[PDB]
Design a protein around this nucleic acid. Structure first.
Ligand SMILES: [Zn+2]
Ligand SMILES: [Zn+2]
Lengths: 113, 93, 796, 72
RNA sequence: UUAAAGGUU
RNA sequence: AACCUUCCC
């Protein structure tokens, strides 16, 4: 009885862009894995076709880290918004387990067709 | 310096493993034999084959470094020999 | 009862004979890899939920083909129906039935899986990992069923021993193709789950001993083209069986079938990187972490271990003649030498020297020292050797005659014996008697000791558990300090000892330490940080008093390695030898109350104290290379400031080249050392202590993870087990908080005192009885599956 | 009394070794086997005949003058 | 191995 | 232990 991911991992709003400083203000749904030794986000969701860079300012504020993303994954979500064609991005170097946890949470509590 | 230069020049980079240098270049082989049965399967006769080459026997000695003729190595006469037999041979062509 | 049997068989028309009576289930005892929100581990449980049926064969013969039915809820029935009609077309999926039958007054659903085997691979891994002599009863059945041996093979004496019965290596190796085909079949399952959009965890509970996969209960489905097979516990738990059963021997044959002859590789080929990548893609396709065939490109110590494990597995396919120094011709003053300019480690891959000097003009004292030490010229100028007395690889014979070395009987002091006898000693029926003597030896003594280095075998370690264990073990060496020192600070105990193979023909170690000034020594040390210097260690034969007639031998290592290893471990280990109250008690005297202080320290606040001790049968000649590399890495962990990554890697390469797989000169002929450790180098005792601590921590981890978990009545220990499983098989990065917590737990409940390969431990008896800390059988199983050695009660 | 046998076996092997017996491989091998096995015996009823077998080795050469050296 | 939390004597 | 609740298929 091996369970994929007990407990669900939540998400905040983050900023991304195509390259370098293309990040404008806030354009991404960042599914996070918060640990008390620093916050580490898991996945990115967007309605933007091709975003490769993302950014988060450090906790001290003086710094801001950029994250490089994988090629997009396309799916459709069902909502009162009707169908939503959305593209999902994994920060390159994400292991299979974080991918599985995010995908399981999404397929469990977010509608898909 | 002639059988070693040829095999070195065939390397793509010039690097060859050390353990193949005496295997394909050395001109003398010394086999050590613990018993007659192992002698039968490996060093039988005046000429044998090893390392994909043909070698011919020239000298055989016992543990006491005394000469043994090839006729004395029998089955029944084996118990009368010091038996780490060292057989040295030259690579024949 | 009859209709259930006629429905379970169904269309396939099989002659099922019920193993469980009636329309009821059949509880069994099976091993599980389990992880809930409550409990985790890899342990044996009771499995109800099942109605087995054995299949008959023409003349009513019973075969291993089971029709296991599964009673469960309606929701699970729907969930497994909607996912099996997605992975239906994969060969590696056992055929399901999914029918509904009226059991008693209500209609219940069943998921009938056709033609499985009695045991899964969790059972095989558990039986070969947690081994006990007189409780086997399932390893025997697995071996007998698949024609690895017979039933009368188990009536032998010590049939499980790796040392006194070296034929068990052949019995296991006949069970090594069902594992290769299982890996081949799980790769297809992973690909099918990918292309079909399914996410889930692959556990080796759901793969029968053929290769088919038959559970989809904890799976989820996403859009096609993106499916995630989570294979981290599967491969990690399976790793030791791959080399214990020698599963990849079929790669030695052409077209990968055991009936065809072996592949005839080119003799001059030394770089097998493409083959290594091909094998990794073949069998470990969905292993997420990256793999570096050559460990010169690794990122840190942990990645070095991770890639060296895979290289250990993959180097058993390539010819033994391609491993060793990579020699190359260079010209000086118009005269050509043949000198070593690299190495090809079985574990570390190909390493190239950075400061190779081609077309030089003169050789200084440093260069003359370097070129006189490597085996290049000595082997290339000698004649070929074929020694039938040993199975170890023989390269060359330096002289024209072999030398036989004898041992003298020893002198007798008659006056003391006469005095003692006059004092009423040595009578009949006395509690004291002579048992220690000087034993003599015949001509073949050392060449008989090399057939004990024959005992070393290539071993693949469980990489995730090994990484966690190394992180825990590193905390026992935190109170110390270390680093590099200049040639001024080196302290040499005795300067009248031999300098090694070449160099003993000219003087002792004093001559080579005066001749070279401090600048030359510093230059040699700095050279060793970016080049590899293979050396030769002589094999001397000892002459001392003992109680057993074995001709013990020692290693005369050369002088260059001595200097360069001193300029590291002098400062590393003088701190270890000068600390009081630590776990490692090296350097603490027993006089002036040292023994009492040590014993009182090892009794430091244990709740229900018991004492236990053990000894490894053959520590030096059977220790796997992976653990020696681990010990060297944790010793080099102290150079975080004085050395960059490249310097650390090249120092590790030098160590592996001259104290692990060096070229030994035994009686005037050069032989290749399979592995183990060379007793006679600078850091033998400290590396042995590190290895001992690693084994103890591994035993504790195995003892804790194999406990049921539902029965543990203490919440803190249950949460500790849960988080231990998470930190082992669900995290890629070190968690310092839980490492500290587990180290504190071990120090509280399992107090050690270590000195080289000797250990004394005070442990909580209640926890040990409950299975929360390591017992002695946990040590025996760990030794069996991680040391290729079976330990008995004569040592513990 | 077995201690006497073990000590005299030690002395006999010492004198045999110093008589250049080890220049013949098989004779030295047999002598070493006998000496090592006498030291490990646990009853006096096997050590004595192995001792007599080992003494028959020295009584066969012509390097030890016997009549003179048993001057009593 | 058996949703969770809470509740009383 | 009895016991009920938002329940859970
Ligand atoms: Zn690496
Ligand atoms: Zn350093």
């Amino acid at each position: 009885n091996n369970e994929l991911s007990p407990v669900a991992l939540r998400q905040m709003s983050c900023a991304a862009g195509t390259t370098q400083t293309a990040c404008t203000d806030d354009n991404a749904l960042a599914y996070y894995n918060t640990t008390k030794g620093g916050r580490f986000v898991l996945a990115l969701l967007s309605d933007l076709q091709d975003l490769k860079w993302a950014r988060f300012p450090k906790s001290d504020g003086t710094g801001t880290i950029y994250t490089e993303l994988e090629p997009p994954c396309r799916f459709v979500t069902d909502t009162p918004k009707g169908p939503k064609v959305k593209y999902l991005y994994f920060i390159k170097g994400l292991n299979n387990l974080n991918r599985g946890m995010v995908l399981g949470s999404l397929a469990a509590t977010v509608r898909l067709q | 310096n002639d059988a070693l230069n040829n095999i070195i020049n065939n390397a793509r980079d010039g690097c060859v493993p050390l353990n193949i240098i005496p295997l394909t270049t050395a001109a003398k082989l010394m086999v050590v034999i613990p018993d007659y049965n192992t002698y039968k399967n490996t060093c039988d006769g005046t000429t044998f084959t090893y390392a994909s080459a043909l070698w011919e026997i020239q000298q055989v000695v016992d543990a006491d470094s005394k000469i043994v003729q090839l006729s004395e190595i029998s089955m029944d006469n084996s118990p009368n020999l010091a038996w780490p037999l060292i057989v040295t041979a030259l690579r024949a062509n | 009862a009859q209709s259930f049997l006629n429905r379970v068989c169904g269309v396939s028309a099989a002659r099922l004979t019920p193993c469980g009576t009636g329309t009821s289930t059949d509880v069994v005892y099976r091993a599980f890899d389990i992880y809930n929100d409550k409990v985790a581990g890899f342990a044996k449980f009771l499995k109800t939920n099942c109605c087995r049926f054995q299949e008959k064969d023409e003349d009513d013969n019973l075969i291993d083909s089971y029709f296991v039915v599964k009673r469960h809820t309606f929701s699970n029935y729907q969930h497994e129906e909607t996912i099996y009609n997605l992975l239906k077309d994969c060969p590696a999926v056992a055929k399901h039935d999914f029918f509904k039958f009226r059991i008693d007054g209500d209609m219940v659903p069943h998921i009938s899986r056709q033609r499985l085997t009695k045991y899964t691979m969790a059972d095989l891994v558990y039986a070969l990992r947690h081994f006990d002599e007189g409780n086997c009863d399932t390893l025997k059945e697995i071996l007998v069923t698949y024609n690895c041996c017979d039933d009368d093979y188990f009536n032998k004496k010590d049939w499980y021993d790796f040392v006194e019965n070296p034929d068990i290596l052949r019995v296991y190796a006949n069970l090594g193709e069902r594992v290769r085909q299982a890996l081949l079949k799980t790769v297809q399952f992973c690909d099918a789950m990918r292309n079909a959009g399914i996410v889930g965890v692959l556990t080796l509970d759901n793969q029968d001993l053929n290769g088919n996969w038959y559970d989809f209960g904890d799976f989820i489905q996403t859009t096609p083209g993106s499916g995630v097979p989570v294979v981290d516990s599967y491969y990690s738990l399976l790793m030791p069986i791959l080399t214990l059963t020698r599963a990849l021997t079929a790669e030695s044959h052409v077209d990968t079938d055991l009936t065809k002859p072996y592949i005839k590789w080119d003799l001059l080929k030394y770089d097998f990187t493409e083959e290594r990548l091909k094998l990794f893609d073949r069998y470990f396709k969905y292993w997420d972490q990256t793999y570096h065939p050559n460990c010169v490109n690794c990122l840190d110590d942990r990645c070095i271990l991770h890639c060296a494990n895979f290289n250990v597995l993959f180097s058993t396919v390539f010819p033994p003649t391609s491993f060793g120094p990579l020699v190359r011709k260079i010209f000086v003053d118009g005269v050509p030498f043949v000198v070593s300019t690299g190495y090809h480690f079985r574990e570390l891959g190909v390493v190239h020297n950075q400061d190779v000097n081609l077309h030089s003009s003169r050789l200084s004292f440093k260069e003359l020292l370097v070129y006189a030490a490597d085996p290049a010229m000595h082997a290339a100028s000698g004649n070929l050797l074929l020694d039938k007395r040993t199975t170890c690889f023989s390269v060359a014979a330096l002289t024209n005659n072999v030398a036989f070395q004898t041992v003298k009987p020893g002198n007798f002091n008659k006056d003391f014996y006469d005095f003692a006898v006059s004092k009423g000693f040595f009578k009949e029926g006395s509690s004291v008697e002579l048992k220690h003597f000087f034993f003599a030896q015949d001509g073949n003594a050392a060449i008989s000791d090399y057939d004990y280095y024959r005992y070393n075998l290539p071993t693949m370690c469980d990489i995730r558990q090994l990484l966690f264990v190394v992180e825990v073990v590193d905390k026992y060496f935190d109170c110390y300090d270390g680093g590099c020192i200049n040639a001024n600070q080196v302290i040499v105990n005795n300067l009248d000892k031999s300098a090694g193979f070449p160099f003993n023909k000219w003087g002792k170690a004093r001559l080579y330490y005066d001749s070279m000034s401090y600048e030359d020594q510093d230059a040699l040390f700095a050279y060793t940080k970016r080049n590899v210097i293979p050396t030769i260690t002589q094999m001397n034969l000892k002459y001392a008093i003992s109680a057993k007639n074995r001709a013990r031998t020692v290693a005369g290592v050369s002088i260059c390695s001595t200097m360069t290893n001193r300029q590291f471990h002098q400062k590393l280990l003088k701190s270890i030898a000068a600390t009081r109250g630590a776990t490692v008690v090296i350097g603490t005297s027993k006089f002036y109350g040292g023994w009492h202080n040590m014993l009182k320290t090892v009794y430091s606040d244990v709740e229900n104290p018991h004492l236990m001790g053990w000894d490894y049968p053959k520590c030096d000649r059977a220790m796997p290379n992976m653990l020696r590399i681990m010990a060297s890495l944790v010793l080099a962990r102290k150079h975080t400031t004085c050395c960059s990554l490249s310097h650390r890697f090249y120092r590790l390469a030098n160590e592996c080249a001259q104290v692990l797989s060096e070229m030994v000169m035994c009686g005037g002929s050069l032989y290749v050392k399979p592995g183990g450790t060379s007793s006679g180098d600078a850091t033998t005792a400290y590396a042995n202590s590190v290895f001992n601590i690693c084994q103890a921590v591994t035993a504790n981890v195995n003892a804790l993870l194999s406990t049921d978990g539902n029965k543990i009545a203490d919440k803190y220990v249950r949460n500790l087990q849960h988080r231990l499983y998470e930190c082992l098989y669900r995290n890629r990065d070190v968690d310092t908080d839980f490492v500290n917590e587990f180290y504190a737990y071990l120090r509280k409940h399992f107090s050690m005192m270590i000195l080289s390969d000797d250990a004394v431990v005070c442990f909580n008896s209640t926890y040990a009885s409950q299975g929360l800390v390591a017992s002695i059988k946990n040590f025996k199983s760990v030794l069996y599956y991680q040391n290729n050695v079976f330990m008995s009660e004569a040592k513990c | 009394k077995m201690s006497d046998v073990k000590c005299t076996s030690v002395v006999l092997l010492s004198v045999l070794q110093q008589l250049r017996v080890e220049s013949s491989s098989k004779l030295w091998a047999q002598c070493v086997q006998l000496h090592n096995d006498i030291l490990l015996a646990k009853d006096t009823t096997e050590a004595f005949e192995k001792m007599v077998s080992l003494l028959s080795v020295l009584l066969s050469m012509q390097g030890a003058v016997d009549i003179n050296k048993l001057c009593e």
